[PDB]
Amino acid sequence: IINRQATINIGTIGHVAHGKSTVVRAISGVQTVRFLERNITIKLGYANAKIYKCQESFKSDKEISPKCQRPGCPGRYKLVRHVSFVDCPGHDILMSTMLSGAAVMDAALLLIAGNESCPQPQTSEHLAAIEIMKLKHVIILQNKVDLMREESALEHQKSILKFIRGTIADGAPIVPISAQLKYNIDAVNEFIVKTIPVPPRDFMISPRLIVIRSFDVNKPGAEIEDLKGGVAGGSILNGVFKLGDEIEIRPGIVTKDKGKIQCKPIFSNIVSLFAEQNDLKFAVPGGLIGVGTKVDPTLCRADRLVGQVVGAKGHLPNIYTDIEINYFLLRRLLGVKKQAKVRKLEPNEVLMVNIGSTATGARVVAVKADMARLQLTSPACTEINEKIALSRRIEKHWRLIGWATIKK
Amino acid sequence: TSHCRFYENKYPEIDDIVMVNVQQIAEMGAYVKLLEYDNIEGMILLSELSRRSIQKLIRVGKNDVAVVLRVDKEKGYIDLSKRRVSSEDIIKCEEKYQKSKTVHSILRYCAEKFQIPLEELYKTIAWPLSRKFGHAYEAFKLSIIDETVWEGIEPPSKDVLDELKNYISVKIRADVEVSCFSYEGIDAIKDALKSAEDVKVKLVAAPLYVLTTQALDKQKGIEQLESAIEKITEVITKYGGVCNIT
């Protein structure tokens, strides 16, 4: 069996205490990163699944084990795909991480529990976000079905169907699966192969990398004369990387505190690539790879590198402090428990603008009709156009309003 | 079991000094156990004990310095006197007693370890140490400084001797904070370590480095730590990073 890395990024959405990590575990086997130094940087974890098919019935086709002994046929499984999971939490406080996750995602998985109430605002918000950020491949999954009645589940399904009609997602498949009992995952696997294809990707496009997580490889007990370099957990959308290249983290860093800053973006040479489980020479875009570079282990510690752009040497993108946005607003607010009408944008107000993966606070200067000018506090970079989600404050915490695009 | 003589012989001589620990009083005087010559009882009558509250001063537990007058070398009969002892030599006597005590302490570990009689051990020790040199404590001290007295007698147990030596035979904590933002940092850290370690330096997490500096005469630990700090400061300024010292 060949040790091929991740091909396409699949993300999972839900709610707090509903069950997402458990579902992930059921799907794959290797436990999630979340659940001080290691793993702790963002809200998303790290998981990997296997797609191997046995074609020699009905729904039973794909499996989780490398060896086929369970269904009947003793023959070895055929290699189809290998996928990486991006598990994003569905909490009312933390959403920036989710947004960041969304930017890299190519496939989405919705989770709704049976026993709880049918209309949930957070789930709706998530769906809206998915719709916004160039995602159409959505599979609806029912979580807790075993604790529900014979007709109640059907009713719930009907309600769901009624709800999802006017949205961009038209032909979304619905699967009921148990997380604690471990059943019906084969159908899900089959669907993964059926409904979702891999988009065309080539070597010709300029390298662009997005870092979500940060890692320091330091072990207690062992002497200091045996050290390991700083690892940046970064996912790639476009551009193939190989071992032996120069990488730079774009936005900038503060090194001296009197004296104006002039220091260039953080340069680092690649030491070792961590994909799936074992090290590989080539990096195929469409997965999260722990890129171990010559960067400090102290820098890759905690909340320092959350959603930052990474480029290869011989390419020049632009850095902006003032940004030109083309926005579109929604009718009523999504996320609030009660629904409130969206007000027109007022000059000079603190609003959270999420350009791809960056979590930045911006203030409005001029409003016309569709075009808006924003002043940023923390530095941000622009490459092409980018997919932007906008968030405002009305009551206590952040609420989503609509979508935006950079006009440059 | 604790027994055997302190100097050379079981029975004391004439005019020699002995220290006594009193258990019970008021019958004849004090017929109590000795600490300078064996554990055989020595007696004072109610006249030689007083020099100048007579019952209160001694009673139970307290130590007394007394000179030997009458000896009966047959089975164990010693006579003591307190009045004759002069104040000038009392300090000397005390010192001697202390030395004896130390010697006794030294000959206990052996008894404990190899489960053999203490008296035999004492006999084996006293021949080159307590006879040729003078007193035993000084000989022991000499040996510890430069080994010359242990050479005289062959050791039946070297392990015991080693243990004794060990018995006869300062870490200062420091914290250095690392928070670099430069291009290369690991190498710099390694370099720093190569100048700070060579005593014991350990890694805990990522930003904190814990180091323990050993001092010879307690005050010496300040001179090295400061130097190390200076070296660390020198290290990170050139590349373009920062390291802080609390």
Q: Which domains does chain B have, with CATH numbers?
A: 16-88 (2.40.50.140), 89-169 (1.10.150.190), 170-245 (3.30.70.1130)
AA letter at B29? G
Indicate the annotated binding residues of A for GTP.
Answer: 17-22, 143-146, 178-180
The string of DSSP letters for B88-100 reads: HHHHHHHHHHHHH
The string of DSSP letters for A267-319 reads: EEEEEEEEETTEE-SEE-SSEEEEEEESS-TTTSSSTT-SSEEEEESS---EE
Angle at B60 (CA atoms; ends B58, B62), nearest 5 degrees: 60
- Residue A110 forms beta bridges with which residues? A13, A140
Q: Which member of A220, A224, A268 has the closest CB to residue B183?
A: A268
- Strand ranges across the sheet with B208-214: B200-203, B208-214, B171-178, B243-245
β-pairing verdict for A138-142 and A174-176: parallel
Which tokens hold the place of A270? 């690649």
Q: What share of chain A is helix, strand, coil (3-state, %, to 5)?
A: 10, 35, 50
Assess contact for A142 and A109: CB atoms under 8 A: no
Which tokens hold the place of B21? 């620990």
State whether A220 and B183 contact (CB < 8 Å). Answer: no
In Å, how far are A36, A205, A249, B170, B175 from B204, measured between CA atoms? Answer: 12, 43, 28, 22, 11
- Residue B29 forms beta bridges with which residues? B45
Residues in B whose CB is inside 8 Å of some CB of A read 178-186, 189-190, 193, 197, 201-207, 209, 240-242
In Å, how far are A335, B149, B181, B209 from A39, measured between CA atoms? Answer: 29, 64, 20, 21
Assess contact for A191 and A175: CB atoms under 8 A: yes
- CA atoms of A368 and B173, how far apart (whole Å): 64
Angle at A373 (CA atoms; ends A371, A376), nearest 5 degrees: 145
Distance from CA of A223 to the nearest CA of B (A): 7
AA letter at B232? I
Domains of chain A listed by start with CATH number: 5-201 (3.40.50.300), 202-316 (2.40.30.10), 317-408 (2.40.30.10)
CA A383 to chain CA mean position, Å? 19
Q: Count CB-CB contacts under 10 A for residue A359.
A: 18
State whether B182 and A225 contact (CB < 8 Å). Answer: no
- Residue B72 forms beta bridges with which residues? B77
Which tokens hold the place of A263? 């220091």
Which residues, other chains included, contact A1 with Cβ-Cβ below 8 Å and sequence gap of 6+? A66, A79
- CA atoms of B184 and A227, how far apart (whole Å): 13
The string of DSSP letters for B45-96 reads: ETTTS-----SSSSTTT-EEEEEEEEEETTTTEEEEESTT--HHHHHHHHHH
Q: Which member of B183, B204, B207 has the closest CB to residue A298?
A: B207
- CA atoms of B220 and B204, how far apart (whole Å): 26
How many helices, marked H, and strands, marked E, lie in chain A?
A: 5, 22
Experimental method: cryo-EM
Give CB contacts under 8 A, 24+ apart, made by B123-126: B124/B153, B124/B156, B125/B153, B126/B8
Q: Which member of B179, B203, B240 has the closest CB to residue A263?
A: B240
User: B210 to chain A: nearest residue by CA?
Assistant: A224
Assess contact for A133 and A356: CB atoms under 8 A: no
State whether A266 and B204 contact (CB < 8 Å). Answer: no
Q: Count CB-CB contacts under 10 A for residue B196.
A: 22
- Strand ranges across the sheet with B42-45: B17-21, B63-72, B77-81, B42-45, B29-32
Q: State phi, psi for A214 to the nearest 5 degrees.
A: -125, 140
Assess contact for A359 and A101: CB atoms under 8 A: no
Resolution, angstroms, 1 dp:
9.4
Which tokens hold the place of A242? 């190989």
Assess contact for A72 and A123: CB atoms under 8 A: no
